[PDB]
Amino acid sequence: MQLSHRPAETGDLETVAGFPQDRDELFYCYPKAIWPFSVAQLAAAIAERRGSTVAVHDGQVLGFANFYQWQHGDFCALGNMMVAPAARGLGVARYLIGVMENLAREQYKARLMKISCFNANAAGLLLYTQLGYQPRAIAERHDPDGRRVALIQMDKPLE
Numbered sequence: 257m258q259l260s261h262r263p264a265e266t267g268d269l270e271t272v273a274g275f276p277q278d279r280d281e282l283f284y285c286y287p288k289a290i291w292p293f294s295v296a297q298l299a300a301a302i303a304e305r306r307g308s309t310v311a312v313h314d315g316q317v318l319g320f321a322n323f324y325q326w327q328h329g330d331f332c333a334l335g336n337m338m339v340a341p342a343a344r345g346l347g348v349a350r351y352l353i354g355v356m357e358n359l360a361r362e363q364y365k366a367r368l369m370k371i372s373c374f375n376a377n378a379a380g381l382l383l384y385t386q387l388g389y390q391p392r393a394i395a396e397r398h399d400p401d402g403r404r405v406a407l408i409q410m411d412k413p414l415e
């Protein structure tokens with residue numbers, strides 16, 4: 257894996273919008289989105305968020321992430337973390353999370369990164385734990401079927 261990163265571009269939209277493979281995956285990375293996902297929904301998120309970034313390997317966009325909260329001198333909150341289906345488990349999310357941690361430190365002077373993860377997303381909970389994130393709180397949310405889910409709110413000091 258030879259990964260690089262750059263800001264997301266218009267031309268990447270269609271690729272990235274192809275990443276969520278089912279309603280659960282879309283919900284875990286973008287819970288306000290409606291299935292089926294679309295470029296317009298992704299672009300609307302990008303326009304109201306900050307730091308939309310892609311990860312690239314062998315000429316392919318393999319990952320995407322941004323911030324949905326940012327508070328200068330304080331923290332950022334990571335969201336829209338998506339990985340191409342052929343590139344799962346290969347370190348793309350770990351890579352991009354490290355890039356986003358640097359961006360939060362450098363641009364926003366953040367002392368903390370927040371990641372919230374829905375309870376069903378075991379792979380996410382385990383990854384964030386490996387990367388040094390700690391659970392802090394659990395909040396109730398509702399999924400598109402009106403069923404109660406638990407949002408596990410995690411954080412990590414930055415340096």
Ligand SMILES: Cc1cc(=O)oc2cc(OP(=O)(O)O)ccc12
Pocket residue numbers: 284285286287324334335336337372373374397407
């Ligand atoms: C997990 C997740 C990803 C994302 O991109 O946005 C989120 C936005 C969220 O907003 P509320 O706290 O429900 O207002 C919750 C979770 C996420």
